[PDB]
Every structure is written in C-alpha cells, then in structure tokens.
Design a protein around this ligand. Structure first.
Ligand code: CDL
Ligand code: 3PE
Ligand code: 3PE
Ligand code: PLC
Ligand code: LMT
Lengths: 50, 82, 92, 88, 62, 108
C-alpha cells in the first residue's frame, strides 16, 4: 500500500473501519515481507540454478 | 521483525544443539569436555557424525553461512555499535 | 381466583454495583467481526476438496507414517558407550 | 555535533538560487515568493517536474505526486519544505 | 465509608488527611505513604517468610 | 479507452512517468555526469513525443513507457532515512502525551 497516504494507524497502514479479510494475519505489516522485484518462480529458478 | 528473524534462526540451530546434547549424554554419559575428549577416539564414527552434524547446524545458524545468513543482514537494523 | 403471583413478593432491578469506568478502548466494529468469525469457524466449517486434503493428511497419513517409524525402530538402537566396529543396532 | 536548523529565509534563499541556475527559466528578477512556475517563470509541464526533483535533492526529501502536482508556486514549495521536520 | 473514600480517591485524586493540631480534615494530594492495602500484612509476614523457610529446608534436606 | 492528449489527467500521468524515469536513472547510475546525460536524453525522448494527437498511438506509447519502466526497476531505491522506506523512520517516536485513565476503584 502507498506509504505516503495518511492512514489513522500509520504504522500498520490501516484505517479505522477498514474491512478485514479472513486471512488478514498474513496480509498485514507484521506478516512476512513480500518482494516485488522477482516473481517467486523465477526466483526459485535463479537460486537453484546458481 | 529482524529481531524475530535472528532469534528464530538461533532456535533453529539450538534445537539441533540440544539434539546433540541429548546424544552426547546418551553416549558418553556426561557433558564435560575432559571426558568426551579423552574418549572420542574409541566411539563409533556414526555417532560422532550425528553429534557433529547437529552442532555444526547450530554453528551454521549462528555463524551465518549460506543456508542461514538471512538474519545477519537484517541485524543491521539496530545501532552501529551492536 | 385469577392465578397470578403473590403480591407480597416485592421485586426490583438487578444492580451488580460495579463502578462504571471510563472508556479505555475504542471498539472498531470490523476487527470484532473478524474475531467472531475466526472464533466460531467451527459452526460453519464444511467439507470440501481442500479441507479433506488437510484432514486426511494430518489424521491418516502422518500418524500412520510416525507409527510405522516407531514400530520399526522400537527396540532397535542402543548405543551407549559403543565403539568402533560394534553395531549400534540390536537387529537387522 | 549536528548543530544546524532550517529557517524560512534560508529555504527561500536556496530555492531562488536553484531557480537562478535553471537555464529554461524566462529570466532572473521574476523569481519571488509570489512567482508562478507556468505563467511567470515560463516553464513547461515537465520543467516543473525537474524543479521539484531538484528541491528534493536539495533539501533531502521525497515528494509524492499528490503533494507535487499541487506545487504551482514558489511560496507553496517554501511552505511545504517548512512542513517536513526532516527538511535538512 | 468504603465507597465514599474510594470514589473520592479516584475522582478528586486526593485523600483526606487531618493534620496534627487543627480539627479540620480536607482532601489533599500527598500520597507518598500513609496508604496501605488490606492484603499486605497477611502476605509479606505469613506467606513470604514461609516460602523462605521452604527454600531453606529444601537446601538443607538436599 | 479515451486517453486524451491535451488534458490534465494525461499531464499528471506523464509527469509521474518522467519523475519515475529520473529517479530510476539516479538509482541505477553512480556517477553524476552520466546521470545528467541520461536525464537529458529522457527529456529529449519525451519532448519528441509530446506532440502526438491520435489517442491510439499515444496510448501505445504510454504502454511502451510502462514496459520500459518495469524493465529497469530498481530493487533497492534511494530513499531518505527519515521517510518510510528508510533506516531512521520510526526510530524515536515522541510518545503521545496522554493522561492516565483509570480502570478500577481501589487499585492505582
Ligand atoms: C514443588 C517445589 C517448589 C519449589 C519452590 C522453591 C521455593 C520458592 C522460593 C520463593 C522465594 C520467595 C521469597 C519472597 O517471597 O519474596 C517476596 C518479594 C516480592 O518482591 P517485591 O519487591 O516485594 O515486589 C513488589 C515491588 O517491589 C513493588 O513495586 P516497585 O515499585 O518497587 O517495582 C520494583 C520492581 C519492578 O521491576 C520489574 O518489574 C523488573 C522485573 C522483576 C524480575 C525479578 C526476577 C528476579 C531477578 C533476579 C536477578 C538476578 C540475576 C542473577 O522490581 C523489583 O522488585 C525487583 C528488584 C531487583 C532486585 C533488587 C537488586 C538488589 C540487589 O521479594 C522479596 O522480598 C525478596 C526475595 C528475594 C529472594 C531471592 C533469592 C536469592 C538467594 C541468595 C543467593 C545466595 C544464597 C542462596 C542459598 C540460600 C540457602 C539458605
Ligand atoms: C510446513 C510445516 C513445518 C513443520 C516443521 C517446522 C519447520 C521449520 C519452521 C517453519 C514453520 C514456519 C515458521 C513461520 C513463522 C513465521 C513467524 C513470523 O511471522 O515472523 C516472520 C519471520 C521473518 O520476518 P520478516 O518479515 O522476513 O522481516 C524481515 C524484514 N526486516 O520469520 C522468520 O524469521 C523465520 C523463522 C523460521 C526460520 C527457519 C529457517 C529454516 C531454513 C532452513 C534452510 C535449510 C537449512 C538446512 C537444514 C539442515 C536440516 C538437515
Ligand atoms: C478419519 C476420520 C475422518 C472424519 C470423518 C467425519 C466425517 C463426517 O462426520 O461427515 C459429516 C457429515 C456432514 O458433512 P457436511 O456436508 O460437510 O455438513 C453438513 C452441512 N451441509 O455428516 C455425517 O457424516 C453423518 C454420519 C452419521 C453417522 C453417525 C454414526 C452413528 C454413531 C453411533
Ligand atoms: C560472475 C560475474 C558476475 C559478477 C557481477 C557483475 C555485476 C554487473 C555490474 O555491472 O555491476 C557493477 C558494480 C559496480 O558498479 P558501481 O559503479 O561501482 O555502482 C553500482 C552501479 N550499478 C548499480 C549500475 C551496478 O559491481 C562491480 O564492481 C562488479 C565489477 C566486476 C568485478 C569482477 C572481478
Ligand atoms: C480419510 C478417511 C478414510 C481413511 C480412514 C482410515 C481409518 C483406518 C481404517 C482401515 C482399517 C484397516 O484395518 C485393518 O487392520 C487389521 C489389523 O490392524 C487387519 O487385520 C489383521 O489383523 C491382525 C491383528 O492385528 C490379524 O492377526 C491378521 O493378521 C489381519 O491381517 C485388517 O485387514 C483390517 O481391519
């Protein structure tokens, strides 16, 4: 999500009455970090190929 | 989050370390360096292999070799003196 | 006679008598619903092709594999103080 | 150690200097707090972008789109840079 | 008295302290002492010492 | 779709693409001379196609810019330390000054 927008909870990037998905524990900021450069399949190709 | 990553790689190594401690104490009946090193030249290589593999896996975690060097670069999120 | 409760019973309200403290939480309304759902998932759980996969894995295959491992390796290993050349097993 | 602080006058001195070094400006002595970018100084709709990128590198910022496209004035940019505690 | 004392202690954030000589008590701010809880005399003087006795006994039975 | 060649929305769009291209150059390149050279080349590549009027070729060109910018993405962008993707963001947050709300009638 865009960090430059003003959210109520600026750290977790969540507004107050924002609806939550059933699997929000995976899709919040405390969850493991995503990587947006390489798609994960090509990443696995590169790691194992190296 | 970097702190959690560092301490969970720690326990990923410490688990095997306890497995090695349990094996050292099943085999030699003790944990001290004196007895274990006065005898290790008599005990089956398969047992020392299991021991040292586990202790090495713990050392791989803490010493941050290629399999478990994740935490090390993340550990720079703290202050420089640390 | 009209069948009604006795008039000698003097009734009144229930005052548990707690001191109503200030609002130290701001309820959010959506977090609470997410929690109600994750808490009462059991009353809506349905069997499908993924639920069945997970269920049969964790309640048939893994228990059966762990049990095969155990009941093979029951009295096998015994290697306290063993030495070079000596077998660590009690069986073949 | 880093005993340094910013001021509205200092931000104004640095912004006008940044604009005086810009070749695609109309000419000097039009530049002032009330100076517009598209009308007075005579700048394209990409030179405004280059000027904002320049203010970023100058005061060490990161100005997004929704805060950038609304900069159509030098005093606006001054009030903006004064509204970032980390303005260097 | 319990209810009045404690509701005022919370709301005003004062306690009533009659000083030595003047026979007139009023709410006051001083709270650095002179206030004890009803559970202290029991625990700190009957439970804790018994735990310490238990420690001593485990040590000298070892 | 209708991406109009001479309206504010296309202006916002192309200004954003120009900002992004410049930051990508600044992040990819180390030295400063080559950064200024690439910047000038990009401004030339933009002014060359600021003149188009057909919406179709315009939108095709915008798609080509999107593919180019996706093709020169940087995984570790330069960002200021005190701003979100930085090393000193929420380091020492001044705690909000709040007053002690009470919960119990006998306990502090
Ligand atoms: C089944 C069988 C089961 C077997 C069970 C075995 C038996 C269990 C034994 C239980 C013992 C219980 C004793 C007890 O009741 O204490 C109550 C009482 C409870 O604590 P309290 O202070 O009243 O709590 C209220 C707050 O203080 C009031 O609030 P506050 O505002 O004052 O906040 C202060 C608080 C707030 O701070 C905190 O929250 C910090 C976290 C507290 C962690 C405390 C854990 C202990 C840390 C020890 C560190 C040592 C590292 C090495 O911090 C502290 O109170 C801790 C102060 C740190 C120590 C002071 C340094 C002086 C040196 O503690 C004591 O009065 C003292 C007990 C200390 C005994 C320690 C034993 C040491 C032995 C000596 C070693 C050498 C000889 C040993 C062999 C002896 C042979 C004879
Ligand atoms: C599938 C069933 C598994 C059952 C057996 C258990 C297997 C091992 C444990 C894995 C289970 C999943 C663990 C999930 C915990 C996640 C908790 C969490 O949310 O924290 C995320 C944290 C990473 O935090 P992150 O978001 O990346 O922040 C970095 C940005 N500064 O997450 C972490 O830091 C990771 C903590 C776990 C570290 C495990 C590393 C394993 C790597 C193995 C590599 C192979 C090495 C060879 C081993 C030899 C074995 C013979
Ligand atoms: C290995 C263990 C696997 C666990 C098997 C349990 C499966 C099960 O009980 O099935 C539940 C089934 C209802 O299934 P479902 O369609 O998902 O829910 C109805 C809502 N529409 O409903 C049934 O299975 C009904 C079976 C009734 C038989 C009761 C047995 C008599 C007890 C004495
Ligand atoms: C196996 C061979 C593969 C090695 C990796 C090649 C990286 C390619 C590159 O071009 O990276 C070059 C950088 C130096 O670039 P820089 O100017 O100092 O700043 C970073 C500028 N970037 C972001 C544009 C890269 O790394 C090197 O010094 C590699 C020099 C090769 C030394 C071999 C001995
Ligand atoms: C996902 C849900 C679907 C899977 C559910 C799985 C639940 C398990 C059901 C399968 C049960 C099969 O159980 C099977 O085991 C017994 C022994 O254990 C076998 O019977 C065997 O018993 C032994 C004694 O232990 C006899 O001496 C004899 O050798 C015989 O071969 C039967 O052939 C069968 O009853």
């Amino acid at each position: 999500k865009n960090p430059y927008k003003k959210y109520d909870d600026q750290q977790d990037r969540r507004n107050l009455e924002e609806p939550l998905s059933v699997n929000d524990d995976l899709y919040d900021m405390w969850s493991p970090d995503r990587f947006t450069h390489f798609k994960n399949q090509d990443a696995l190709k590169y790691f194992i190929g190296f | 989050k970097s702190a959690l990553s560092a301490v969970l790689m720690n326990r990923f190594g410490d688990a095997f370390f306890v497995l090695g401690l349990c094996v050292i104490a099943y085999v030699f009946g003790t944990l001290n360096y004196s007895t274990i090193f006065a005898t290790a030249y008599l005990i089956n290589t398969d047992l020392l292999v299991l021991i040292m593999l586990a202790l090495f896996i713990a050392a791989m975690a803490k010493s941050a070799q290629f399999g478990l060097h994740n935490w090390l670069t993340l550990a720079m999120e703290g202050p420089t003196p640390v | 006679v009209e069948l009604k409760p006795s008039s000698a019973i003097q009734r009144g309200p229930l005052n548990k008598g707690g001191w109503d403290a200030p609002h130290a939480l701001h309820n959010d309304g959506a977090i609470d619903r997410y929690a109600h759902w994750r808490t009462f998932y059991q009353e809506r759980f349905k069997y499908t092709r993924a639920t069945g996969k997970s269920t049969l894995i964790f309640l048939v295959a893994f228990p059966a594999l762990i049990g095969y491992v155990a009941y093979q390796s029951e009295g096998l290993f015994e290697f306290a103080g063993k030495r070079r050349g000596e077998s660590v097993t009690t069986r073949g | 150690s880093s005993a340094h602080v910013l001021t509205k006058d200092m931000i104004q001195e640095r912004i006008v200097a940044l604009l005086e070094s810009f070749d695609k400006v109309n000419d000097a002595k039009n530049i002032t707090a009330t100076a517009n970018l598209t009308s007075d100084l005579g700048l394209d709709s990409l030179d405004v972008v280059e000027v904002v990128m320049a203010i970023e590198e100058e005061f060490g910022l990161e100005i997004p789109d929704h805060d950038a496209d609304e900069i159509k004035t030098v005093q606006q940019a001054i009030d903006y840079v004064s509204a970032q505690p980390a303005a260097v | 008295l319990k209810d009045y004392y404690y509701n005022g202690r919370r709301i005003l954030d004062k306690i009533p302290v009659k000083d030595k000589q003047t026979g007139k008590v009023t709410w006051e701010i001083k709270r650095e002492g002179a206030e004890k809880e009803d559970w202290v005399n029991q625990m700190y003087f009957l439970y804790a010492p018994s735990l310490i006795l238990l420690l001593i006994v485990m040590v000298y039975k070892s | 779709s209708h991406p109009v060649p001479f309206s504010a929305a296309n202006k916002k769009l192309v200004t954003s693409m120009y900002r992004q291209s410049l930051k990508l150059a600044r992040n990819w390149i180390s030295n400063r001379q080559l950064f200024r050279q690439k910047a000038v080349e990009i401004r030339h590549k933009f002014d060359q196609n600021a003149q188009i009027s057909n919406p179709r070729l315009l939108a095709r060109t915008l798609d080509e810019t999107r593919a180019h910018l996706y093709e020169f993405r940087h995984p570790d962008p330069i960002v200021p330390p005190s701003f979100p993707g930085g090393t000193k963001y929420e380091r020492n947050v001044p705690p909000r000054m709040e007053k002690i709300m009470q919960h119990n009638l006998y306990e502090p």
